[PDB]
Design a protein around this motif. Structure first.
Motif, mmCIF file in Angstrom:
data_model
loop_
_atom_site.group_PDB
_atom_site.id
_atom_site.type_symbol
_atom_site.label_atom_id
_atom_site.label_comp_id
_atom_site.label_asym_id
_atom_site.label_seq_id
_atom_site.Cartn_x
_atom_site.Cartn_y
_atom_site.Cartn_z
ATOM 1 N N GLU A 167 3.082 0.584 0.666
ATOM 2 C CA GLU A 167 1.744 0.083 0.952
ATOM 3 C C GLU A 167 1.700 -1.040 1.979
ATOM 4 O OE1 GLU A 167 -1.009 2.018 -0.527
ATOM 5 O OE2 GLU A 167 0.970 2.930 -0.243
ATOM 6 N N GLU A 169 -0.844 -2.546 5.370
ATOM 7 C CA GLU A 169 -2.066 -2.412 6.148
ATOM 8 C C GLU A 169 -1.716 -2.325 7.621
ATOM 9 O OE1 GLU A 169 -5.730 -4.537 4.979
ATOM 10 O OE2 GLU A 169 -4.455 -5.653 3.557
ATOM 11 N N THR A 170 -1.731 -1.105 8.147
ATOM 12 C CA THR A 170 -1.414 -0.891 9.545
ATOM 13 C C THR A 170 -2.156 -1.894 10.404
ATOM 14 O OG1 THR A 170 -0.921 1.472 9.383
ATOM 15 C CG2 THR A 170 -1.691 0.629 11.519
ATOM 16 N N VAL A 171 -1.466 -2.426 11.397
ATOM 17 C CA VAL A 171 -2.081 -3.395 12.273
ATOM 18 C C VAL A 171 -1.634 -3.131 13.702
ATOM 19 C CG1 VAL A 171 -0.184 -5.047 12.048
ATOM 20 C CG2 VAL A 171 -2.474 -5.852 12.635
ATOM 21 N N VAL A 181 0.353 -11.386 8.717
ATOM 22 C CA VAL A 181 0.213 -10.291 7.770
ATOM 23 C C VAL A 181 0.675 -10.689 6.379
ATOM 24 C CG1 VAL A 181 0.914 -7.944 7.197
ATOM 25 C CG2 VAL A 181 0.520 -8.574 9.585
ATOM 26 N N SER A 183 2.554 -10.218 3.066
ATOM 27 C CA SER A 183 3.771 -9.510 2.694
ATOM 28 C C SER A 183 4.708 -10.375 1.877
ATOM 29 C CB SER A 183 4.512 -9.038 3.941
ATOM 30 O OG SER A 183 5.873 -8.790 3.646
ATOM 31 N N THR B 37 -0.586 7.250 5.835
ATOM 32 C CA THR B 37 -1.655 7.163 4.847
ATOM 33 C C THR B 37 -3.041 7.274 5.457
ATOM 34 O OG1 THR B 37 -1.556 4.733 4.995
ATOM 35 C CG2 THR B 37 -0.298 5.796 3.226
ATOM 36 N N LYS B 39 -6.644 6.879 6.819
ATOM 37 C CA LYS B 39 -7.869 7.164 6.094
ATOM 38 C C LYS B 39 -8.854 7.832 7.055
ATOM 39 C CE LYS B 39 -9.490 2.329 6.617
ATOM 40 N NZ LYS B 39 -8.892 2.199 7.984
ATOM 41 N N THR B 83 -9.397 6.060 1.883
ATOM 42 C CA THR B 83 -8.152 6.735 1.562
ATOM 43 C C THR B 83 -8.523 7.674 0.425
ATOM 44 O OG1 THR B 83 -7.483 5.099 -0.123
ATOM 45 C CG2 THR B 83 -6.836 4.674 2.150
ATOM 46 N N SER B 118 -3.941 5.763 14.111
ATOM 47 C CA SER B 118 -3.366 4.492 14.482
ATOM 48 C C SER B 118 -2.179 4.837 15.381
ATOM 49 C CB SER B 118 -2.922 3.717 13.231
ATOM 50 O OG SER B 118 -2.310 4.564 12.282
#
Lengths: 215, 118
Positions: A167, A169-171, A181, A183, B37, B39, B83, B118
Motif C-alpha cells: 500500500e 500512495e503513488t506520487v 511522503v 511511510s 492498484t 483507481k 479503488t 500514473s
C-alpha cells in the motif's frame, strides 16, 4: 474495444510530431475514437502548443489507425531545461445499442504526455531516476528529484518486494522538486518507479544516517 | 505497455414504470502485466444528486454502487477516482463488479469509465 499502445507518451522536443497506434479489436462492430489534449491541470486545450489529430475518427471492426501529436509555434515558450506535462485522452464511442433502457459504458484512457525539450533529450534505456534522494523526516521521507524530468513513484518499502507490492500512495515529482511522503522508517528503503515505456524498476537505497541515496 | 482495454459493456432494464431495482453488472478490463492498484473514475455528461442524468434539465437517474461480494455496497461518487471493492482475476483479465439502481428527477444513457494511468 478501442485500445491504445501505451500508458504514457514522451514527445521528443526535437521532433515536430509523433504518432500513437490505436485499434478497435471488436470483431463485429465499428467504434468512434475521440482524441484530445489537456494541460498540466487536465483542462482541455484546442490551440496548442500540443495538438491531437484527428479530434474524432471511426474505426471499423478490427481496424487499426493512429493519432498524431504535433506541436505549434508557441511550443518554444515552454522551458527548454525541463519537461512540461500534458495529458493525452482517448475516449471510445461504442456503436449505439439497438436495445432499449440501456446504460452504455465507454472507456476513456488518459495518459501522461511528457514534452521533453531537445536540450534534455534522452537516449534509449537511459536511467535518471536513480538520482532521487530520500531524506528521512517525521511521517516518512521527503523525496527529492533533482532531474529535469517528471518522476512517478509507485512504491516505497523496507524490502524490494515491499516496494513492488505494498500500500503506497503513488506520487509524481515534478522536475527539480521535492515532496514528503507518509511511510514507515526502513533501514534499507527500496523505491519503485515507472520508466518511459511502462516498465516498473526497483531501486535499492543506502542510508547514510538521515540521507539515503542509490549507490 | 498497451493500455487496458474494456470490452463493450451495457446493463439492461425491461421496464419499471434514490434507487429502485438494484442491479448487478460487470466490467472486465484486460490490462498490462504489471499494472498496480490504479483507481478509475466514472463520469457522465450530465449528473444530479450523484446520479447520471439521462435524456430539458430533467431526466432519468442512474445510480452506481461499488458491488460488495454480490451485496450492494458503497455508492459511487461520480467524478471521483476509486479503488474497486470487487475485483477478480489477473491483470490480463480483470473484472469489476458494480451495482446500478435507478430513479427520476427508450433511453440509452452513457457513462464514461476513466482510466488515468500514473
Amino acid at each position: 474495444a478501442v485500445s491504445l499502445d501505451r500508458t504514457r507518451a514522451v514527445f521528443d522536443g526535437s521532433e515536430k510530431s509523433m504518432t500513437l497506434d490505436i485499434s478497435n479489436d471488436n470483431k463485429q462492430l465499428p467504434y468512434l475514437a475521440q482524441a484530445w489534449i489537456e494541460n498540466e491541470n487536465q483542462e482541455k486545450i484546442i490551440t496548442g502548443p500540443v495538438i491531437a489529430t484527428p479530434p474524432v475518427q471511426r474505426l471499423e471492426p478490427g481496424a487499426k489507425s493512429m493519432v498524431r501529436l504535433s506541436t505549434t509555434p508557441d511550443i518554444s515558450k515552454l522551458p527548454q531545461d525541463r519537461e512540461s506535462l500534458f495529458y493525452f485522452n482517448l475516449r471510445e464511442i461504442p456503436p449505439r445499442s439497438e436495445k432499449a433502457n440501456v446504460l452504455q459504458i465507454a472507456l476513456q484512457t488518459k495518459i501522461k504526455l511528457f514534452y521533453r525539450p531537445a536540450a534534455i533529450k534522452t537516449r534509449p534505456n537511459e536511467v535518471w531516476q536513480d538520482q532521487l534522494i530520500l531524506n528521512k523526516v517525521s511521517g516518512g521521507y521527503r523525496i527529492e528529484n533533482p532531474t529535469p524530468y517528471y518522476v512517478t513513484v509507485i512504491g516505497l518499502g523496507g524490502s524490494e518486494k515491499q516496494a513492488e507490492e505494498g500500500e503506497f500512495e503513488t506520487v509524481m515529482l515534478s522536475p527539480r522538486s521535492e515532496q514528503t511522503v507518509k511511510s514507515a522508517n526502513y533501514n534499507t528503503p527500496y523505491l519503485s518507479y515507472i520508466n518511459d515505456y511502462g516498465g516498473r524498476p526497483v531501486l535499492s537505497f543506502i542510508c547514510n544516517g538521515s540521507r539515503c541515496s542509490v549507490k | 505497455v498497451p493500455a487496458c482495454t474494456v470490452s463493450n459493456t451495457t446493463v439492461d432494464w425491461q421496464d419499471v414504470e434514490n434507487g429502485n431495482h438494484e442491479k448487478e453488472f460487470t466490467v472486465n478490463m484486460r490490462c498490462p502485466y504489471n499494472l498496480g492498484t490504479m483507481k478509475v473514475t466514472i463520469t457522465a455528461t450530465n449528473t444530479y444528486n450523484n446520479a447520471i442524468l439521462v435524456q430539458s434539465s430533467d431526466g432519468l437517474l442512474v445510480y452506481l454502487y461499488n458491488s460488495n461480494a454480490g451485496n450492494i455496497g458503497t455508492a459511487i461518487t461520480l467524478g471521483t477516482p476509486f479503488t474497486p471493492g470487487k475485483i477478480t482475476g489477473n491483470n490480463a483479465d480483470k473484472t469489476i463488479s458494480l451495482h446500478a439502481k435507478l430513479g427520476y428527477k427508450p433511453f440509452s444513457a452513457t457513462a464514461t469509465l476513466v482510466a488515468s494511468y500514473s
